Amino acid sequence: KLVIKLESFKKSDFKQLINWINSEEFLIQWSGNAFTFPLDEQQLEKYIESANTLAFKVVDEETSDVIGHISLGQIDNINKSARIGKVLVGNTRSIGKHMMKAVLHIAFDELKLHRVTLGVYDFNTSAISCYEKIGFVKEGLLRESKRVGETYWNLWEMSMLEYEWKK
Amino acid sequence: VIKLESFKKSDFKQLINWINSEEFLIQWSGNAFTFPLDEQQLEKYIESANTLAFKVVDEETSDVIGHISLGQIDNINKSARIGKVLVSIGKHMMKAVLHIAFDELKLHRVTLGVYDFNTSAISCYEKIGFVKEGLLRESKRVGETYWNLWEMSMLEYEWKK
Ligand SMILES: [Cl-]
Ligand SMILES: [Cl-]
Ligand SMILES: [Cl-]
């Protein structure tokens, strides 16, 4: 089962992602503080040129369509860590699980890192269950850490260490 | 007993002398610096965006007795991070920075990190009102080993004095 492949996200994929991220609230769920709504070409250009960041389009092996997005950021070669983020299943079997496993393969097997982190807002309980099934562990709840209008959201900080990925 | 004042070039040598090893540099400041600490790194620190650097001044003698910082000051999320804490006095320093954060800057959340072996600092911070949120496992590499960091926080409704 090669169901998806990761390829480098490029300028010709920008409009598609701009269309998928259709509201401010959704932009925040997807990417936190990385961007302002709406997304535009200048923000995405800065993203794909940033140091210590790998940006991926997710390609369906069957159709060759681009069906999502994912990123490995904060790549830190002193502490041997990185952060998965900007996780989007754009359409469609768990494509999300395949995407997570493909990026984890890059992080632990190709880059040889020790620790991979991820943040997810506490109301996204089906994503959280999926991530726990893959092997992520909740480290703690960052209380009221993102402001969204007049309220604050709480973020679960989650991680996997290399001995949880492979023995 | 203490006041916080803007950290300047004339305070750099003193701080460089206080930071005598790489392990201590890491306990104090995490990933901010490379050992040894030097004037070029400090100049960049005092010019960094979203950062307030403080010398801690004894009101009685006017001597500089420590250091503390409020960093990652974030106006969208109304948050900041206390760090670079260097020394009773420790409590006074924390309360002075918390006063700036909550009462002057009107922030909602203040965070802090402390490595899990520093259990006396942890107790002191819990007495002041910080709450443990979670343990970041094996998050700092130090030589051939890893340390674990407690992420702690105070929200504005948990602050009184
Ligand atoms: Cl544009
Ligand atoms: Cl001042
Ligand atoms: Cl810090």
Q: How far apart are CA A106 and CA A84, in angstroms?
A: 11
What phi, psi does B5 have (nearest 5°)?
A: -135, 155
For the purposes of burial, counting CB atoms within 10 Å of the CB of A153, is it exposed (0-12), middle (13-18) or buried (19 or more)? Answer: buried
Q: Which ligand is nearest to the CA of A19?
A: 1
The resolution, in angstroms to one decimal, equals: 2.0
Range of the domain at A102: 1-167
**How was this model experimentally determined?**
X-ray
Q: Which ligand is nearest to the CA of A14?
A: 1
**The two structure tokens encoding residue A165:** 């990925």
Nearest CA in chain A to B144: A79
Q: How far apart are CA A120 and CA A141, in angstroms?
A: 10
Domain count, chain A: 1
Chain A residues within 8 A of B134 when measuring between CB atoms: 138-142, 157
Distance B57 CA to ligand 3 centre (A): 21
Contact of A140 with chain B, judged by CB distance below 8 Å, is answered with yes
The residue written with tokens 């097997």 in the block is: A109
CB contact under 8 A, A114 and B155: no
Closest CA to A65 of A7, A136, A133: A7
Q: What is the three-class DSSP state of A137?
A: strand
Beta-strand runs (E) in B1-160:
2-6, 52-58, 64-74, 79-86, 109-115, 131-142, 145-155
Distance B44 CA to ligand 3 centre (A): 16
Q: How far apart are CA B110 and CA B97, in angstroms?
A: 10
Q: How far apart are CA A30 and CA A41, in angstroms?
A: 17
Q: What is the three-class DSSP state of A73?
A: strand
Q: CA triplet B155, B152, B160: central angle to 5 degrees?
A: 35
Q: How far apart are CA A21 and CA B11, in angstroms?
A: 48
**The two structure tokens encoding residue A46:** 């800065």
Nearest CA in chain A to B30: A79
CB contact under 8 A, B76 and A152: no
Chain A residues within 8 A of B31 when measuring between CB atoms: 76, 78-79
Q: Is the alpha carbon torsion for A137, A143, A147, A149 positive or negative?
A: positive
Closest CA to A86 of A142, A9, A151, A160: A9
What phi, psi does A127 have (nearest 5°)?
A: -65, -40
